[PDB]
Copies of this chain bind each other. A is one copy, B any other.
Amino acid sequence: GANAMGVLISAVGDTDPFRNFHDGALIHIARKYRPEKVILIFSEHTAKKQGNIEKALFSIAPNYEPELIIHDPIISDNEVHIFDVMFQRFSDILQEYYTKEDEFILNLSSATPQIKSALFVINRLNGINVKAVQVSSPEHASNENIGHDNDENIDELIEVNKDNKVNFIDRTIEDNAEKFSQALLKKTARDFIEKFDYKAALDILDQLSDFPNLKSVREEIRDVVNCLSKQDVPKGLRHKKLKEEEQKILSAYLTIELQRERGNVSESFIRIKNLTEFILEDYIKKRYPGLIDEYCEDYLSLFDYSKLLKATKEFKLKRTIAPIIDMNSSRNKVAHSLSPLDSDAVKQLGIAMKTLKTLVREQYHFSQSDFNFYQDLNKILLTKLN
């Protein structure tokens, strides 16, 4: 299609078009950047000045003929000062006019603070990141004790205006929102962490400008990410109170809970069988040395362990794993098939879950606190990320 035009989106305030022998923000940005289109957002208070605005814009240079879009509806005066209302209004306005194709400029220095705030914020909250320009006061200080030129003769203001030259003094400052963009990225990293997407959180942290806590937070998350992918035990779960296999059991269990939270239900069924199998092997090797080797004159399965628990009169434990044995058919669908699970097969996972937990709680005496590893880690990580 056609090539990009420069479009200046701007509101209008008491300092437009001119004040104190100088350009207001709107005219100054137009004068410097010469946009082809200018979308003008008025309020009831400022609409009376529409003609003087267009006169001022066509007064800049003789071959400068900007296309002036006068937005509709204008902004009601009893809304123009409310923060949250103007945020919505200028979200709506910016979605109405933004195009990927053109090259936009936001005037951050005309109208109420609630409108200027909204423009500054939305530019980055919605990731359009167009050019955002402030215009300094010519006082380079408070405009206290400096009046408004709105009741004056427009043609005079145009003539006396000190910016009415080719070599005007540039009072424009471009915003790049470096610090604010970091806060938005950190917010995303925190959102990811709360929901246990540690890999996605780590991707954000690798692209962050440095600050004190950044390297330890990144180091803590990397170890979690790396170990979990390799199906290892993160350093944080290698409690010295626990034997090595207890650490593997505790971590493998907590990973299925993470898996459940993230909606990976079908993958849970293979993990529950493997963990239960590992726990039973561990229990039988510890309690009946040489039993498994005798049996193995034939990898053992839940069914083999069930027989061994009968042979050893381990009758409570035999009933404990019965719900996990029931979901054997569904585990088979996720392990040797592409057939889908029904909603009943799903609800099993909740039952096996409550069972798995009472199992590991009973055999290894994990505390409520031990089960809370990732929640408690998140707490500390989040505070370290502002």
Contacts and interface: CB of A to CB of B under 8 A. Distances in A.
Interface of A: 14, 45, 77-78, 81-85, 87-88, 91, 95, 108, 113, 116-117, 120-121, 125-126, 134, 136-137, 140-142, 144-145, 147-148, 150, 173, 175-180, 183-184, 187-188, 191-192, 195, 197-200, 225, 227-233, 248-249, 252, 261-267, 270, 274-275, 277-278, 299, 301, 332-343, 345-346, 386
A45 B141 contact: yes
Contacts of A85: 179
A125 B187 contact: yes
A12 to B, nearest CB: 12
Contact of A230 (B228, B262, B266): B266
Contacts of A183: 87, 91, 125-126
Nearest to A13: B142
B274 A338 contact: yes
29 contacts: A14-B144, A78-B140, A82-B134, A85-B179, A87-B177, A88-B180, A95-B386, A117-B121, A125-B183, A125-B187, A144-B148, A145-B147, A184-B187, A195-B200, A198-B263, A228-B266, A229-B264, A229-B265, A229-B266, A230-B345, A231-B333, A231-B338, A249-B338, A262-B262, A264-B267, A274-B336, A274-B337, A275-B338, A278-B338
A322 B67 CA distance: 66
A144 B150 contact: yes
Contact of A84 (B82, B175, B252): B175
Contacts of A175: 82-84
Contact of A228 (B141, B263, B332): B263
Copies in the complex: 2
A209 B263 CA distance: 24
A275 B339 CA distance: 11
Given A117-B121, A231-B340, 14 more contacts: A82-B175, A84-B176, A84-B177, A84-B178, A91-B386, A95-B386, A113-B116, A197-B197, A197-B262, A198-B263, A230-B265, A233-B340, A248-B338, A270-B334
B299 A336 contact: yes
Contacts of A173: 82
A266 B87 contact: no
Contact of A191 (B188, B332, B335): B188
Name the residue among A232, A275, A386 with the largest chain B CB count within 10 angstroms. Answer: A386
Contacts of A14: 142, 144
A15 to B, nearest CB: 9
Contact of A142 (B45, B232, B335): B45
Q: Most chain-B CB neighbours within 10 Å: which of A141, A144, A184, A192?
A: A144
A128 to B, nearest CB: 9
